[PDB]
């Protein structure tokens, strides 16, 4: 995988990606503005990086997000398209670091870096299984 290689992702924001929907179990969130949730924007940014890396993975390799550091600087009601751009900034063998940005066609909405680590799935899923109650 090459440093400086870019992927963009477009996603039209539906009603069910707002703050209320990340945690429908939260009375505290239930009267928030109907805007695209930070945790969902995080998910969309991760997803772009998962897609860009996919065809570089060996069978039975997967990957996990190990860090997210971004601003969220404008709000987006449902119906606008959020475009996420991922650019790969470094690879360490196992460890990739992406610069991610997103806009919603109207404003720049957020900026930063996401990081992930390539894993061996079977033996990752063994180790998680050993802390599963």
Bind-site residues: 36-46, 65, 72-73, 116
Rule CB under 6 A: which of 9-28 touch ligand ENV? 19, 22
Closest separation between CB of residue 58 and its own copies, Å?
15
Determine which residue in the list 1, 5, 23, 120 makes contact with its own copies, applying CB under 8 A.
23
Stretch that binds its own copies, among 36-44, 83-91, 95-103 (CB under 8 A): 36-44
Could you give the angle at the alpha carbon of 30 between the alpha carbons of 26 and 36, nearest 5°? 105
Q: Helix (H, G, I), strand (E, B), or coil: what is residue 80?
A: coil
Given its phi and psi angles, is residue 129 left (phi above 0), alpha (psi -120 to 50 degrees) or beta? alpha
Tokens of 88: 């790969």
**CA distance linking residue 60 with residue 120, whole number of Å:** 6
Rule CB under 6 A: which of 70-129 touch ligand ENV? 72, 75
- The residues of the shown chain that bind ligand ENV, judged by CB under 6 A, are 19, 22, 35, 37-39, 42-43, 46, 64-65, 72, 75
């Amino acid at each position: 995988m090459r440093v400086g290689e870019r992927f963009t992702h477009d996603f039209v924001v539906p009603p069910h990606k707002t703050v209320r929907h990340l945690y429908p179990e939260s009375p505290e969130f239930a009267e928030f503005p109907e805007v695209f949730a930070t945790g969902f924007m995080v998910g969309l940014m991760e997803w772009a990086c998962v897609r860009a890396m996919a065809p570089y993975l060996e069978p039975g390799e997967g990957s996990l997000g190990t860090a997210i550091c971004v601003t969220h600087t404008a709000a987006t009601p449902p119906g606008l398209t959020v475009t996420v751009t991922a650019e790969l900034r470094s690879v360490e063998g196992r460890r990739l670091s992406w610069r991610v940005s997103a806009h919603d066609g109207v404003d720049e909405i957020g900026s930063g870096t996401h990081e992930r680590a390539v894993i061996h799935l079977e033996k990752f899923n063994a180790k998680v299984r050993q802390k599963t109650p």
